Design a protein around this ligand. Sequence first.
Ligand SMILES: Nc1ncnc2c1ncn2[C@@H]1O[C@H](COP(=O)(O)OP(=O)(O)OP(=O)(O)O)[C@@H](O)[C@H]1O
Ligand SMILES: Nc1ncnc2c1ncn2[C@@H]1O[C@H](COP(=O)(O)OP(=O)(O)OP(=O)(O)O)[C@@H](O)[C@H]1O
Ligand SMILES: [Zn+2]
Ligand SMILES: [Zn+2]
Ligand SMILES: [Zn+2]
Lengths: 217, 222
Amino acid sequence: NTRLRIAIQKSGRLSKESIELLSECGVKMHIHEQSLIAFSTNLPIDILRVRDDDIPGLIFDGVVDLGIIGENVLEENELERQSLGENPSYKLLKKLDFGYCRLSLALPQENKFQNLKDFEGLRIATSYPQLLKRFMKENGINYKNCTLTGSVEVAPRANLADAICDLVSSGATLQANNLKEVKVIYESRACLIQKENALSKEKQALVDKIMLRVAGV
Amino acid sequence: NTRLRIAIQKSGRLSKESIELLSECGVKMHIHEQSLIAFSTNLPIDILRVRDDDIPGLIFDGVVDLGIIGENVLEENELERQSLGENPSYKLLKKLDFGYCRLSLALPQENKFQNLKDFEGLRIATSYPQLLKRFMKENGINYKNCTLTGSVEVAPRANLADAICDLVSSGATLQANNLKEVKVIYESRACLIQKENALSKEKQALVDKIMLRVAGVMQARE
Ligand SMILES: Nc1ncnc2c1ncn2[C@@H]1O[C@H](COP(=O)(O)OP(=O)(O)OP(=O)(O)O)[C@@H](O)[C@H]1O
Ligand SMILES: Nc1ncnc2c1ncn2[C@@H]1O[C@H](COP(=O)(O)OP(=O)(O)OP(=O)(O)O)[C@@H](O)[C@H]1O
Ligand SMILES: [Zn+2]
Ligand SMILES: [Zn+2]
Ligand SMILES: [Zn+2]
């Protein structure tokens, strides 16, 4: 249809700043508890509120025009799609001023970390199995996977794993679980991305305008 | 690492009945409602309480010994793993008497369904993209995919997709969203599975004991 589709995180760490950025680019809308879609009141724009993990896929499959997502989630999902034999593509428009975090290897507080080789043959729990797999291959370290979507930091205490690969900024969660960060494998921020296949002149024009305004802020 | 590990859904449509099946089979336990780990108080068993989507991976990777999971989630993740060039493997111990649901192609109620080839070219929203992909390749209908983890039934109303492939039980939600069920592609129930690699003799003996009890419990509940 005529309206531009912009996917953002429904509720989590990027939601507040995604909405703030959209407001500053002249997109007026009301966010309440709409399950999926919020309609801009001043421009022909639909805001899709989704789980963050779905946003790369929506961009790859051409379902939405624009997307605001963390680079970690984007790349996790690109790698998955590549390992399926697919050719995911997207246009990067801008790296943004929020969503700063890093994906790091971590061990229990009372361990003797000398070297990356100390991870050899360990069981490593993570929500980012593709990112971890690529890092370990690149550095020639063999390991055992444990994929968990939540409570990753509880995995060593639960005896499910010897170590974790998790997102960190402040270190507070690691500290709470008596773990210590030992090696960063990936640095991330929020980015604005666009699908591959060409937008309408109507829609592309509207994107260029928002983009002009994005640069402004 | 010698306590038997069993993964179950932490909170959701299988969580209550998984815990109750365990109690019915004589596994006494205390649960702290927000926590990943719980322990049997009378048997050497850890109960790991996780997101259901993680259970098949945990079994395939040998991280736990047993799991209770919907057949739909098991199959979707098996297909995913196979399409990634992996070799996911598990033992099916038992099909269980709860978790009944079905995965169904569905269209707006105000919409003429003559034929399964009506889906040709349609954008289809789903949480089960591998299961959809297999069914559509098998039947020869081409389509465009839209993967959504939740709110799938709202996608047509939101003009993200023309049709959905949706998990339903009662069938009430679809009516609520002004959509009609036109073709079942998968029928699911809860199952009990075990990892591929052999358990120690003592742990396999505990599993054999649990299995006899599950069969008796299931007889008694008819
Ligand atoms: N401590 C942090 N500070 C800033 N940004 C973070 C931090 N941790 C994670 N992020 C970024 O924000 C994104 C969303 O984080 P959040 O914890 O809300 O994800 P989620 O729980 O997977 O969300 P959803 O419910 O949509 O699945 C992460 O993928 C990452 O890009
Ligand atoms: N009416 C139903 N709709 C969806 N799933 C159902 C239904 N009835 C039974 N189930 C079963 O319950 C499983 C759990 O789905 P649930 O609705 O609890 O939410 P979820 O988001 O999958 O849970 P989690 O938070 O663990 O990811 C399904 O995958 C399926 O096997
Ligand atoms: Zn309002
Ligand atoms: Zn997420
Ligand atoms: Zn789930």
